[PDB]
Design a protein around this motif. Sequence first.
Motif, PDB file in Angstrom:
ATOM      1  N   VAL A 190       3.130  -1.010   9.758  1.00 20.59           N
ATOM      2  CA  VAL A 190       2.060  -1.837   9.498  1.00 20.59           C
ATOM      3  C   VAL A 190       0.926  -0.687   8.951  1.00 20.59           C
ATOM      4  O   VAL A 190      -0.116  -1.182   8.554  1.00 20.59           O
ATOM      5  N   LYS A 202     -10.020   3.595  -2.639  1.00 23.74           N
ATOM      6  CA  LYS A 202      -9.529   4.242  -1.397  1.00 23.74           C
ATOM      7  C   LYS A 202      -9.371   5.714  -1.621  1.00 23.74           C
ATOM      8  O   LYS A 202      -8.840   6.094  -2.503  1.00 23.74           O
ATOM      9  N   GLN A 223       0.877  -1.410  -0.060  1.00 21.97           N
ATOM     10  CA  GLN A 223       0.004  -0.034  -0.002  1.00 21.97           C
ATOM     11  C   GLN A 223       0.994   1.308  -0.008  1.00 21.97           C
ATOM     12  O   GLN A 223       0.419   2.271  -0.332  1.00 21.97           O
TER      13      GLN A 223
HETATM   14  O1  LIG Z   1      -2.835   4.100  14.809  1.00 23.73           O
HETATM   15  C1  LIG Z   1      -2.774   2.767  14.350  1.00 23.73           C
HETATM   16  C2  LIG Z   1      -3.590   2.276  13.277  1.00 23.73           C
HETATM   17  C3  LIG Z   1      -3.389   1.128  12.891  1.00 23.73           C
HETATM   18  N1  LIG Z   1      -2.673   0.171  13.719  1.00 23.73           N
HETATM   19  C4  LIG Z   1      -2.430  -1.146  13.055  1.00 23.73           C
HETATM   20  O2  LIG Z   1      -1.955  -1.148  11.824  1.00 23.73           O
HETATM   21  C5  LIG Z   1      -2.443  -2.451  11.217  1.00 23.73           C
HETATM   22  C6  LIG Z   1      -3.014  -2.005   9.755  1.00 23.73           C
HETATM   23  O3  LIG Z   1      -4.108  -1.378  10.039  1.00 23.73           O
HETATM   24  P1  LIG Z   1      -5.436  -1.358   9.292  1.00 23.73           P
HETATM   25  O4  LIG Z   1      -5.679  -3.054   9.281  1.00 23.73           O
HETATM   26  O5  LIG Z   1      -6.520  -0.620   9.747  1.00 23.73           O
HETATM   27  O6  LIG Z   1      -5.178  -1.020   7.782  1.00 23.73           O
HETATM   28  P2  LIG Z   1      -4.808   0.339   7.330  1.00 23.73           P
HETATM   29  O7  LIG Z   1      -5.878   1.493   7.787  1.00 23.73           O
HETATM   30  O8  LIG Z   1      -3.724   0.926   7.661  1.00 23.73           O
HETATM   31  O9  LIG Z   1      -4.840   0.495   5.992  1.00 23.73           O
HETATM   32  C7  LIG Z   1      -3.557  -3.220  12.070  1.00 23.73           C
HETATM   33  O10 LIG Z   1      -2.821  -4.387  12.652  1.00 23.73           O
HETATM   34  C8  LIG Z   1      -3.692  -2.221  13.181  1.00 23.73           C
HETATM   35  O11 LIG Z   1      -3.522  -2.810  14.265  1.00 23.73           O
HETATM   36  C9  LIG Z   1      -1.895   0.547  14.573  1.00 23.73           C
HETATM   37  O12 LIG Z   1      -1.014  -0.373  15.192  1.00 23.73           O
HETATM   38  N2  LIG Z   1      -1.810   1.911  14.887  1.00 23.73           N
END
Ligand SMILES: O=c1ccn([C@@H]2O[C@H](COP(=O)(O)OP(=O)(O)O)[C@@H](O)[C@H]2O)c(=O)[nH]1
Length: 124
Positions: free
Chosen positions: A118, A41, A11
Motif C-alpha cells: 500500500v 509530487k 502510483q
Molecule cells: O510506513 C508506512 C507508511 C504508510 N503506510 C500506509 O500506507 C497507506 C498509503 O499511505 P498514504 O496514504 O500516506 O500514501 P503514500 O504516502 O504512500 O503516498 C496508508 O494506508 C498508510 O496507513 C504504512 O502502512 N506504513
Amino acid sequence: KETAAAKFERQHMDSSTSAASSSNYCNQMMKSRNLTKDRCKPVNTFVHESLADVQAVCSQKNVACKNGQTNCYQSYSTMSITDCRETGSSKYPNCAYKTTQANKHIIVACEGNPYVPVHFDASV
Ligand SMILES: O=c1ccn([C@@H]2O[C@H](COP(=O)(O)OP(=O)(O)O)[C@@H](O)[C@H]2O)c(=O)[nH]1
Ligand SMILES: O=c1ccn([C@@H]2O[C@H](COP(=O)(O)OP(=O)(O)O)[C@@H](O)[C@H]2O)c(=O)[nH]1
C-alpha cells in the motif's frame, strides 16, 4: 472508490517496460498516473516487475518503515525501478522530473486482508 492497493498500483507499478525509461519517462509517467494533477509530487518510484513479484515482497524481509511503523518489507532480490525526482526549475502545472533507472531492493509497506503493498517506502 480507489482502494489503497489500487493506489499503490497506479502510483508505483509499471510492469510494461524492463527499464527502458527514456529521459522523458518521468515527465510523461508522473502526469498520466495523475501525480501532477493537484501539485507536482516531489519524488516517486515506479517498479518494473510483475505485480505478483511485487505483491510477494509482503512475505519477504520484515524491516522497520521510515516512519517507525513495523509493516515494511524488503525484497530479497533487486528489482528494476525508475526514480522520478522533481527538477529545480519545475513549476506546477509544468511538472518536470529527472528520470533515474536502477536495480535495487525495494521496501514497501503492506496492509489488509489480503496483505498487499500500500506504500512505497524506499529502495536500498
Ligand atoms: O510506513 C508506512 C507508511 C504508510 N503506510 C500506509 O500506507 C497507506 C498509503 O499511505 P498514504 O496514504 O500516506 O500514501 P503514500 O504516502 O504512500 O503516498 C496508508 O494506508 C498508510 O496507513 C504504512 O502502512 N506504513
Ligand atoms: O524512494 C522513494 C521515496 C519516497 N517515495 C514516495 O514519496 C512519498 C512521500 O514519502 P513518505 O510518505 O514516506 O513521507 P516522507 O518521506 O515525505 O517523509 C512516499 O509515500 C512514496 O509515495 C517514493 O516513491 N520512492
